[PDB]
């Protein structure tokens, strides 16, 4: 159990793009972003 | 047949087939040796080694042989503790036979030394777990092993500038092996800063012209430990290039064992938060074989909170994940360095609709204060949480100008501040990247890491 | 020649009882004698309860001395005080480790883990050490407070020979001065944090100056005094004069004239240590002996 959970590498007899190009352009409507946009609209309206 | 005389012949001619502390490989021969060596005092064993024919005229080598005879004579296979003095004594003598570069049978002794090193590390952990019952301080055995391996590491010299041969001496063949073993020991004894001497003297001692010329597995483990060290010193970019190159090199390895998958998981456990601090988010495709779906879901929740500017989200995620993040030394650095990315995305979404869509060049402090009221949520001052916490004591929506000032100083927001006007002026434009540039490029330009390929 | 533990306790009791109020005239006497108590503990290789109690209350006395010497004009330089305070915190940390390894507990450990977190407030070593301690030590309100201060004080632009800048630091000066005024802030911890007022103020004005356009008017002294919690105007005037910040109209600071990028000027000595009026006011409402006894 400790060999598999410990941060030290296990011993084994020895014998690519993985990152987002840009997550700023690929925008997805989020719940929090919806409440933030609504807050921007309400502030834009109380401050006319 | 006299088995002690036979063993002394083998050892005198560099045949170390039975020279090992592992009784699972040496049990029967060591038992016969123990029955035949019973009777003889220490001086008689020392004389057996001293007067043996063809024995190398090396005091440290003869001390090693005599120490192995004492071990074989007095070993108690039923008690690992009672035999520990013989085992560790013989191990120290064996490593002492490696300090001299021209020691007798050095090339044949090196594999023996690595084997016995793994054995004695396992036994040292085993005995350190019983430090209270053994009346020893914490990590005493393994620290002793670390001292031995440290002297061995110091004895390894850099190559002669005009060397006469391409022979890789076995002390150079195990250089990176010894570095990773020693640094792993320093991590397990919970004193990882001791790696600093080991990291500083690794490349100067190496004869290899390129770091990629070592075994790629040792390269992966070295980049893993170096990244963890850098991260212990809050150097996020330096750690990130090491975790990243480590995981790429692991992606090149053929997936022979399950332990390779778990090692990749160990790399990702640090590469995901380190990358996220630098404004980088993984594509889970190439990470499916190394991460469970629940881990991906967790880091994806944190990804959403950071991506859309939810500080309260980030602090809640760190609060729920506090215990395993502290175990991997991850909580503090994330608590400190995720907020500025989250703020960056918050004011990113604010400036997008406010400036590029609604055509307002000015950002009043009141607007950003309401936005921070939504993002931060509750603070130490607010009721319902009357005790201060790392998750409610740091961030407050009152400090609009401070957040803006740190965003501009980190190069994450290109804007001017007006404190007496209480507003923040950005450039009148429809392109949002001119106001809020890509965060990873800005961070990496302000904090240039060392060469990801070491040498 | 050496005091056993129980008379070291008797001696520190004598000090807490009879020397604390002798005030900055007895600072050298106090520091030397307390150092002698700790040295007597090291002479006997004793990390028992008496050594813990003595090092703890001695640390508290150091924290009180930090504020007392600075409130008055007596000493200015607290190098030896901070050195012996730090060494005492290291002793306490080691003893806490040995007691935890033996299965015991120390009731005041969390408080002095916080003080230890404030001894070297920019050293990541103490974050590393605090993250491997038990959850009740880590989640203690005092340790949480010290951690919050370490986060708000972190600055990616902190400049000093031998200091590697780290990414995405907060530089939350406003939050720092908000927490320094908190009535929940333990007074001795505040005294410890007063050592960084000048640095935090310098990097606050630097970071703010980088955001102002070239033709921006000087920042009024009222705004900077409420923002940085200066005790009076003479302090912000002496602060600007120290860092060569041009004072326009006698009340405003022209932040673009701040040419320094490090709080520590290369040739001159550091500006003398200062204090906060709120913490002195809190000190006058409570006794020295009360603070030292917890």
Numbering used by the authors:
A (entry chain C): 27 to 41, 57 to 89
B (entry chain B): 1 to 455
C (entry chain A): 254 to 547
Article excerpt on this structure:
The TREX-2 complex (Transcription-Export complex 2) is conserved across eukaryotes and integrates mRNA export into the gene expression pathway and, in yeast, also mediates the location of actively-expressed genes such as GAL1 to the nuclear envelope. The TREX-2 complex has been implicated in a spectrum of biological roles including preventing genome instability, transcription initiation, gene-gating, and mRNA export. We circumvented these difficulties by expressing the S. cerevisiae TREX-2 complex using a single Baculovirus harboring the cDNA coding sequences of one copy of Sac3, Thp1, Sem1, Cdc31, and Sus1. Complementary structural analysis of this material has demonstrated that in contrast to the previously characterized TREX-2 complex from C. thermophilum that the CID-subcomplex is likely not to have a defined spatial arrangement with respect to the M-subcomplex and that the TPR-like repeat region of the Sac3 chain extends further towards the N-terminus than had been previously thought.
Crystals with P212121 symmetry with a = 78.2 Å, b = 84.1 Å, c = 165.5 Å that diffracted to 4.9 Å resolution using synchrotron radiation were obtained of the TREX-2 complex. However, the volume of the asymmetric unit (1,087,701 Å3) would only have accommodated the entire complex if the solvent content was of the order of 12% and so it was likely that they instead contained a proteolytic fragment of the complex. Consistent with this hypothesis, limited proteolysis experiments showed that in the TREX-2 complex Sac3 was cleaved by both trypsin and chymotrypsin to yield a stable fragment at about ∼60 kDa. The TPR-like repeat helices and the winged helix domains of both Sac3 and Thp1 were clear, although in places the density corresponding to some of the loops was less clear. Unfortunately it was not possible to identify unequivocally the residues linking these helices and so, because the density due to the side chains in these cylinders was not sufficiently clear to enable individual residues to be assigned unequivocally and so they were modeled as polyAla. No other difference density was observed that could correspond to the CID domain of the complex (containing Sac3 residues 727–805, together with two Sus1 chains and a Cdc31 chain), consistent with the crystals containing only the N-terminal half of Sac3 (up to about residue 555) together with Thp1 and Sem1. Although the material used in crystallization trials contained Sac3 residues 1–805, it was likely that, as is commonly observed, the CID-subcomplex and possibly also residues at the Sac3 N-terminus had been removed during the 2 weeks needed for the crystals to grow. Consistent with the possibility, micro-seeding attempts using these crystals in crystallization trials using freshly-prepared complex were unsuccessful.
